[PDB]
């Protein structure tokens, strides 16, 4: 426990945890999404995950940076459904643009005709801070550079 | 909201002027001496390239 306000301000302005995200050792983040959080990130951002209105409205209570404007569903008829990518897009703030590959991305898919439309949903692409393509993994939400 | 299939209004001479102004304003070693200028391009050679 610091015992003075100048030491308190030094803890605030230097030592605090969000200021210590990037290592100067290897210009990479030191903190990453780990364990079942990472496992359920991979299990949520799959293509087949369809989430009903009730579950989305429960899940949006845990996002304090939400602007209280509900996104329009991926499917409007007959039942309104959201996808896992459509609610991960709410988590990602600001203008964030990124292209990476999932760990099971085949090597011959990039030279094929299905480069920008993945049969296996393995080309991760985020445009304008909302997730568009791909299944996230350690390569996208880990300690690796350019994540 | 840049449309990449529509004609643009950016002349290349303004691109050259903006790049030159940006590289003149992106300094590391300050001063106007020969040593200071030479150390400035030696510090910013890879960034300028």
């Amino acid at each position: 426990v610091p015992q003075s306000m100048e030491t308190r301000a030094e803890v605030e302005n230097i030592h605090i945890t969000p200021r210590q995200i990037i290592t100067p050792q290897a210009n990479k983040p030191v903190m990453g999404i780990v364990q079942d959080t990472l496992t359920a990130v991979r299990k949520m951002t799959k293509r087949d995950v369809f989430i009903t209105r009730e579950q989305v409205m429960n899940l949006l209570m845990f996002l304090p940076t939400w602007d209280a404007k509900m996104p329009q569903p991926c499917i409007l008829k007959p039942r309104p459904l959201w996808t896992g990518k459509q609610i991960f897009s709410l988590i990602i703030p600001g203008n964030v643009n990124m292209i990476r590959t999932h760990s099971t991305h085949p090597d011959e898919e990039d030279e094929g005709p299905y480069k920008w439309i993945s049969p296996g949903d393995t080309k991760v692409m985020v445009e304008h801070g909302e997730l568009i393509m791909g299944i996230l993994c350690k390569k996208s939400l880990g300690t690796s550079a350019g994540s | 909201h840049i449309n990449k299939r529509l004609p643009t209004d950016l002349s290349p001479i303004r691109v050259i002027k903006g790049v030159k102004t940006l590289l003149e304003r992106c300094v590391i070693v300050t001063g106007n001496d020969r040593i200071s200028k030479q150390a400035n391009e030696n510090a910013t050679l890879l960034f300028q390239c």
Partner: protein, 147 residues
């Protein structure tokens, strides 16, 4: 008013490389009037289809029949009384890229890539049949199975 595209499609190949997702089917389709090519990911459990089916597909920019744009945020009021009543499958997405001529090629062919919340469409064909398509434009899929 607001209908960017409208055609009747025949399904000619369903999951050609194997079914990779449980609730998502991939349809390869060819049209009848305008010789288009379609790759579309649909919800398999919610709207099942078989090979050789015919379906009417309408790509619109709004559900309002007078052509005025929508509010952009979901409410569970206005999905009836509109152009979506005549269709059994309504989806919502946006274009993330348009391939084809780019800048240094002829405009004989054109491809448009749409991401409905993670589900993917590639619609390709003649460039004059894809007027009004642009990147980061939101759009509606309307889809009804024919007999």
């Amino acid at each position: 008013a607001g209908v960017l595209f409208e055609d009747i499609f025949n399904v000619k190949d369903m999951d050609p490389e194997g079914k990779k997702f449980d609730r998502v089917s991939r349809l390869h389709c060819e049209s009848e009037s305008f010789k288009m090519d379609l790759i579309l990911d649909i919800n398999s459990w919610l709207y099942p289809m078989e090979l050789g089916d015919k379906f009417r597909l309408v790509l619109a920019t709004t559900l309002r029949e007078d052509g005025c744009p929508d509010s952009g945020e979901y409410n569970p009021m206005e999905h009836e009384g509109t152009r979506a009543d005549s269709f059994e499958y309504v989806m919502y997405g946006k274009i993330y890229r348009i391939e084809g001529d780019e800048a240094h090629n002829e405009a004989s062919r054109l491809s448009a890539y749409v991401s409905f919340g993670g589900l993917l469409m590639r619609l390709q064909g003649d460039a004059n049949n894809l007027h009004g398509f642009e990147v980061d434009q939101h759009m509606y899929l309307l889809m009804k199975r024919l007999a």
